[PDB]
Amino acid sequence: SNKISCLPRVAQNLGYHYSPDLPGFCPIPKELAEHWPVVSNDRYPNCLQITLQQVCELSKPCSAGYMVGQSVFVQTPGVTSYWLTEWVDGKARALPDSLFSSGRFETNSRAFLDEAEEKFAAAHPHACLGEINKSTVGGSHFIFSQYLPPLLPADAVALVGASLAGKAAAAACSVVDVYAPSFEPYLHPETLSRVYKIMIDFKPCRLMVWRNATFYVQE
Amino acid sequence: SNKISCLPRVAQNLGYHYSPDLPGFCPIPKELAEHWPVVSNDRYPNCLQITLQQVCELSKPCSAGYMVGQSVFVQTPGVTSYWLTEWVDGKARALPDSLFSSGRFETNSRAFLDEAEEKFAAAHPHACLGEINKSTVGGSHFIFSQYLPPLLPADAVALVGACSVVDVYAPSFEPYLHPETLSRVYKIMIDFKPCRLMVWRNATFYVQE
Numbered sequence: 523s524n525k526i527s528c529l530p531r532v533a534q535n536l537g538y539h540y541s542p543d544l545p546g547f548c549p550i551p552k553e554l555a556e557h558w559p560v561v562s563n564d565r566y567p568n569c570l571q572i573t574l575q576q577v578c579e580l581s582k583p584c585s586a587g588y589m590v591g592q593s594v595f596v597q598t599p600g601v602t603s604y605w606l607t608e609w610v611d612g613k614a615r616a617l618p619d620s621l622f623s624s625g626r627f628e629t630n631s632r633a634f635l636d637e638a639e640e641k642f643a644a645a646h647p648h649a650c651l652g653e654i655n656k657s658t659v660g661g662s663h664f665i666f667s668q669y670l671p672p673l674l675p676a677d678a679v680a681l682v683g684a685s686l687a688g689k690a691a692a693a694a695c696s697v698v699d700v701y702a703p704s705f706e707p708y709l710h711p712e713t714l715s716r717v718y719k720i721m722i723d724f725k726p727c728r729l730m731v732w733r734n735a736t737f738y739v740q741e
Numbered sequence: 742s743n744k745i746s747c748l749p750r751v752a753q754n755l756g757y758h759y760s761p762d763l764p765g766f767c768p769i770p771k772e773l774a775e776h777w778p779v780v781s782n783d784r785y786p787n788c789l790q791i792t793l794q795q796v797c798e799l800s801k802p803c804s805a806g807y808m809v810g811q812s813v814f815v816q817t818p819g820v821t822s823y824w825l826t827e828w829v830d831g832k833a834r835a836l837p838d839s840l841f842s843s844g845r846f847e848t849n850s851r852a853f854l855d856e857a858e859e860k861f862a863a864a865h866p867h868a869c870l871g872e873i874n875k876s877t878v879g880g881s882h883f884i885f886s887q888y889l890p891p892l893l894p895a896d897a898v899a900l901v902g903a904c905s906v907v908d909v910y911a912p913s914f915e916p917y918l919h920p921e922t923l924s925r926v927y928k929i930m931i932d933f934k935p936c937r938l939m940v941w942r943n944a945t946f947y948v949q950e
Contacts, residue, residue: 648923660922692922715945719876728876732941736923 523591525563526604527572528584529623531678533561535724536608536617538570545591571607581607582617585701587625597624599635599701620721626665626699627676634666635701642703648736650702652684659684659692663738665699678722679739696739698722705729705737745782745793745823746808748844750901752780754933755827755836757789764811790826800826801836804910806844816843818854818910839930845884846899846908853885854910861911862886865944868918872905873939873949881905881948900931900948907931907948918944 523545527533530546541547542555543562550560559568571577588595588603597603608615624635634640643650643666652662652669659669662684669684669692679698685691700722708718708729718729720739728740749765752758760766760780769779779788790796807814807822816822827834843854853859862885872881882889884906897906909931917927917938927938937949 655923656921658921660924715870715941717871717873717878717947726876728873730924730939732924732943735941738924 525591526574527561527563527589528604528606529587529589529594529625529628529676529723531676531725532584532586532606532622532723533570533572535678536570544572546589565609567609567612569609571609573605573607576605577607578614580614580616581605584622586622587628587699589625594625594628596626596629596631597622597635597701599638599703618721618724620724621700621704623676623678623723624665624699624701627674627680632666632670639666639702642706646702646709646737649738654686654690657690659686659690659695661736661738662692662695663697664702665697666702667697670697678725679727679741698739709733709737743782743793744808744810746780746791747803747823747825748806748808748813748842748847748932750903750934751803751805751825751841751932752789752791754902754930755789763791765808784826784828786828786831788828790828791823792826793823795824796826797833799833799835800824803841805841806847806908813844813847815845815848815850816841816854816910818857818912837930837933839933840909840913842899842901842908842932843884843910844908846893846906851885851889851891858885858911861915865911865918868911868914868945869907870945870947873937873947878947879904881907883911884908885911900936901934905948914938914946918946 527544527546538559538561539548540550541561542550542552547561555566561570565571583602583605585597586603587597608617648661650664652667653660662669669686674680679696681694682697683693684695708731714733716731720727720729731737746763746765757778757780758767759769761769761771761774762781766780774785779785781788784790802821802824805822806816827836869881871878897904900907917940920942923942925940929936929938940946
């Protein structure tokens with residue numbers, strides 16, 4: 523294929539599990555795609571339309587991990603990967619704001635995307651780098667963090683155990699493959715502690731922020 | 742004969758709603774209390790037994806707000822108020838550990854229970870950061886707090902099922918407020934209603950449920 527798509531969870535979370543054209547979703551006859559909610563490159567009355575360029579006033583640009591046929595690709599920070607356009611009865615409806623997964627989980631890359639993320643990580647070390655306090659592990663919240671297992675699931679925000687063999691362990695710590703700097707807007711609140719409603723791949727989440735100290739995420 | 746009861750919500754979050762003897766709950770005929778889960782001072786094959794002294798090794802001592810008949814009394818800290826024994830199919834089972842309400846709300850008290858709580862409040866003047874209800878994070882204070890109105894009608898809400906005011910002996914939170922890591926989420930109970938408690942390491946926290 524030379525057919526673009528989001529990481530499937532992005533569309534699924536919006537409520538779209540079928541596709542006549544895209545391989546990452548459940549297939550369906552095209553006859554039925556007219557009368558049923560679907561992801562596609564093509565347009566249908568009730569539809570999430572994934573395109574390489576803007577369609578409409580209300581098409582959302584997403585700098586995000588994406589896939590072309592079977593091949594998954596990592597996001598390029600600052601660069602749109604695809605435009606989503608939600609159709610209901612052939613009328614475009616606006617999509618909510620949301621952070622996006624970089625495609626690092628499914629491509630198995632633990633690497634920083636660009637240098638700005640590496641600098642961001644070292645600047646907010648408690649939240650990103652991971653550290654060991656007594657017998658517990660704290661702050662291993664990004665795919666690039668330290669005490670994480672060999673394999674990680676591709677979720678918006680994965681719950682996994684973290685560990686330093688012998689010394690420490692932490693069960694069910696939340697881990698995310700988002701381009702870390704995308705959090706920067708939330709890191710300076712009026713109050714010292716602050717709690718934001720956010721979305722990662724359109725999955726409602728809770729961003730917990732302690733100013734100049736740490737942040738983490740839940741579902 | 743010593744109609745010693747918990748604050749009704751304690752038994753109710755534990756699943757018991759009827760009682761042949763205790764006025765805090767729904768009436769049920771004594772004859773039928775053999776064949777239905779109940780709260781009582783007496784023993785039935787399925788019941789929550791509230792007594793003044795221990796009954797058996799699985800009876801849970803509870804320092805908490807309590808009642809004698811209709812009258813409601815406040816927690817004396819460091820002293821057991823009632824013992825709870827949960828009978829099921831005639832055999833006692835263990836009860837989960839939980840925090841407990843002091844009974845100040847239903848007493849119209851705003852007072853500290855002792856000097857230990859006063860000193861805690863001074864030492865942590867803004868420990869309670871709010872209550873998490875889904876995404877929205879609404880306001881929440883200890884019943885003694887300076888920032889609460891003098892009137893707290895039951896159109897605010899204490900910490901139990903049927904602006905959020907927590908009527909609990911503040912120093913019982915002290916095990917949670919000192920985590921090793923910078924953040925930590927704890928699973929606790931308050932009056933046996935399950936809650937999460939989401940703490941920062943600066944001894945501040947949000948409540949959930």
